[PDB]
Ligand SMILES: O=C(O)[C@@H]1C[C@]2(C(=O)O)C=C[C@@H](O)[C@@H](C2)O1
């Protein structure tokens with residue numbers, strides 16, 4: 001079976017642990033819903049944050065998902081683009097799937113709805 | 118048929134949107150040419166920039182490739198390494214392919230030729 | 235032909251090329267041993283460093299592994315988390331494997347042992 005990336009983006013209003021975990025968790029839950037994703041079928045996840053977020057690693061939210069404790073995940077710093085969306089958390093979830101490239105459901109929540117094509 | 122990463126790297130002279138998109142597009146086009154890559158066979162793409170580039174997300178270049186609108190892509194900051202090549206943009210393009218690991222054609226352009234194997 | 239991420243993390247005491255390369259090599263070797271990984275089965279690898287490390291790209295240590303010269307690798311900056319583990323190097327090695335997700339052997343060494351689930 002083919003492997004496919006699934007993108008997500010969301011934002012927080014302030015650099016706190018509560019915000020980052022809550023919003024990341026909601027972002028992951030929305031992607032799982034739209035793509036019917038099962039954790040055994042997740043190759044890996046990459047989470048990024050803009051350099052104005054430091055309170056907590058977003059990946060901590062992944063363990064708030066029952067069954068996902070073995071999904072490998074790592075975080076990275078997003079580049080700082082002049083005029084770019086602030087306080088932004090992004091996800092690239094790599095999954096085993098038969099779903100055609102153009103039918104993959106990429107999820108944009110909160111202030112990240114402006115990045116969606 | 119297996120999944121493999123394809124690497125690219127290039128540089129720009131000025132932190133401007135026009136040059137970052139021009140050089141990134143040229144890099145992607147060269148990778149596409151050398152590896153005969155179709156966009157539906159692309160699992161996902163990661164683009165990075167050294168911390169001295171801020172004008173635009175290099176991923177914006179991907180959208181000016183005809184047929185590549187559904188290819189998931191995200192950006193990250195390259196590690197800041199002392200004496201490293203400056204104003205550098207890199208790509209990791211993950212594809213489905215029959216080509217053996219030692220035969221994949223990784224691409225290094227402009228000043229990033231000194232990184233070439 | 236399922237694909238799975240393997241995670242690794244380690245730390246160094248001083249920001250020198252010698253220690254970064256040595257600890258990175260040791261981390262990779264432990265991962266390759268625990269998972270029985272052959273370089274041809276590696277899709278790609280991502281390595282990260284916290285922003286307190288600047289001496290060398292950790293990826294340089296990969297070419298000290300005989301047979302690994304064609305494995306595509308790139309590096310990124312880990313996000314700077316307040317109170318986060320300092321001087322930390324991480325790996326996400328993406329591999330073709332039939333080992334189930336719960337049996338993948340992720341490796342945490344030196345001071346990174348605190349990151350284990
Ligand atoms: O290396 C790690 O495993 C730890 C844990 C972590 C998480 O919170 O899940 C996952 C990935 C890393 O970016 C961070 C956060 O350090």
Ligand SMILES: O=C(O)[C@@H]1C[C@]2(C(=O)O)C=C[C@@H](O)[C@@H](C2)O1
Nearest residue numbers: 126207232291293294307308309
């Ligand atoms: O793009 C590259 O190929 C070069 C080489 C490098 C390494 O030292 O292995 C590997 C990946 C990149 O992050 C850096 C370091 O630039």
